[PDB]
Ligand SMILES: Nc1ncnc2c1ncn2[C@@H]1O[C@H](COP(=O)(O)OP(=O)(O)O)[C@@H](O)[C@H]1O
């Protein structure tokens with residue numbers, strides 16, 4: 001019984017390690033943008049839209 | 053060279069060279085023959101005063117607009133108006149200038165074809181292009197979407213546009229305009 005429990009736990013732990021290795025590996029892909037605002041109180045362009 | 057941006061309209065003809073802020077010459081589009089007899093000799097009385105000249109002698113004329121509802125009903129008078137616009141209000145011969153007329157949506161084909169035939173045969177322009185009167189008004193606002201209600205003096209039309217793609221099945225043209233309000 002102890003041997004069976006040990007082998008089952010070993011297999012489960014090995015699978016969990018294989019998963020968790022890549023789980024911790026590339027977890028920085030969550031870096032994205034937040035798109036805050038600044039009120040753009042300094043835009044003083046001219047009316048020359050020809051490019052559309 | 054520079055292009056002539058004419059805009060026939062119905063009630064006020066607005067014209068001017070491309071690239072400015074305001075039309076160079078704006079004047080009513082009316083052609084009025086005199087109706088009384090005339091007794092002074094040698095006064096130099098013409099047979100038809102067009103444009104802004106007939107808004108000063110209107111006391112003895114019978115003004116008649118050559119454009120009823122967008123469409124043109126009297127081609128000789130419209131030709132006279134165009135000739136006046138080119139030669140006296142802008143003083144540029146049309147042989148050396150492209151023209152950009154404007155036309156209301158959902159107008160009869162024959163009107164547009166006759167317009168281009170006149171511009172190419174009589175005035176003999178190098179090249180002319182006809183544009184729908186609402187897309188331009190959308191250009192001027194600096195937008196690229198939006199539904200524009202262009203209530204002129206002849207006809208009121210309502211062209212919706214999204215992202216530059218006009219929706220031809222949603223144009224609602226109504227013939228109530230400034231002239232009916234005047235009446
Ligand atoms: N300041 C104003 N207030 C009210 N109505 C005006 C004014 N200016 C023009 N209109 C009306 O609009 C008409 C001119 O419309 P316009 O845009 O020149 O027509 P079009 O599209 O043919 O150029 C005139 O007949 C007049 O009845």
Ligand SMILES: [Mg+2]
Nearest residue numbers: 061185204205
């Ligand atoms: Mg108009």
